[PDB]
């Protein structure tokens, strides 16, 4: 049921630069008109942002960035929050996130995707462990992650990853990167979202 709720909140995103689609990804609605989106993408050259078929510009929303502490050093999370000033409301699923959730290595993981490339899709995999950071050969850093074995592709970023903790099923965060049969999602805590939800009111 949670998976269904999440798929219901997942929208396709197409970043356009001069009539050209320079990138695609997913946007996971978490409440009102707030959607978790890939930060590394919402920081490039765009003239139009297509959200579920709706053409927008940077003036139709606000992007909040989460700052997490990794071993005492404050780092920027790849999971950012795009809040549309106006639009159709999405279901509130913030209570499905966690703060002190534990994932048993090897347990079922589910990635929820919805983009212009593969359409509505689900990818399953097995939990590995948490990872403080995953730097790119270029210097880009993604902190507070959770690794898992799975077949992921570019454009999956933004989709939510679900895991299990005993009889509990919850949202770990949003897919950020992957390859070599292994993927990573940026962890998003329940508190992070609650405080952020209260801020936007």
Swiss-Prot record:
Start and end residues of each Peptidase C3 domain: 1-193
Active-site residue numbers: 40, 78, 157
Signal peptide: none
Residues flagged as site, Important for catalytic activity: 176
Subcellular localization, as worded in the UniProt entry: Host cytoplasm
Catalytic activity: Selective cleavage of Gln-|-Gly bond in the poliovirus polyprotein. In other picornavirus reactions Glu may be substituted for Gln, and Ser or Thr for Gly
Biological role stated in the UniProt entry: Cysteine protease that generates mature viral proteins from the precursor polyprotein. In addition to its proteolytic activity, binds to viral RNA and thus influences viral genome replication. RNA and substrate bind cooperatively to the protease.
UniProt protein name: Protease 3C
Organism field: Foot-and-mouth disease virus (strain A10/Holland/1961 serotype A)
């Amino acid at each position: 049921d949670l998976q269904k709720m999440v798929m219901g909140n997942t929208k396709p995103v197409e970043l356009i630069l001069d009539g050209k689609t320079v990138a695609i990804c997913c946007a996971t609605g978490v409440f009102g008109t707030a959607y978790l989106v890939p930060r590394h993408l919402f920081a490039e050259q765009y003239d139009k942002i297509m959200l579920d078929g709706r053409a927008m510009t940077d003036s139709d929303y606000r992007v909040f960035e989460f700052e997490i502490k990794v071993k005492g050093q404050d780092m920027l999370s790849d999971a950012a929050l795009m809040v549309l000033h106006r639009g159709n409301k999405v279901r509130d699923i913030t209570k499905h996130f966690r703060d002190t959730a534990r994932m048993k290595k090897g347990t079922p993981v589910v990635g929820v995707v919805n983009n212009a490339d593969v359409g509505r899709l689900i990818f399953s995999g097995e939990a590995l462990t948490y990872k403080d950071i995953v730097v790119s050969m270029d210097g880009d850093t993604m902190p507070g992650l959770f690794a898992y074995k799975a077949a992921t592709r570019a454009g999956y970023a933004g989709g939510a990853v679900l895991a299990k903790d005993g009889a509990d099923t919850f949202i770990v965060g949003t897919h950020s990167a992957g390859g070599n049969g292994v993927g990573y999602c940026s962890c998003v805590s329940r508190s992070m979202l609650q405080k952020m939800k209260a801020h936007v009111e």
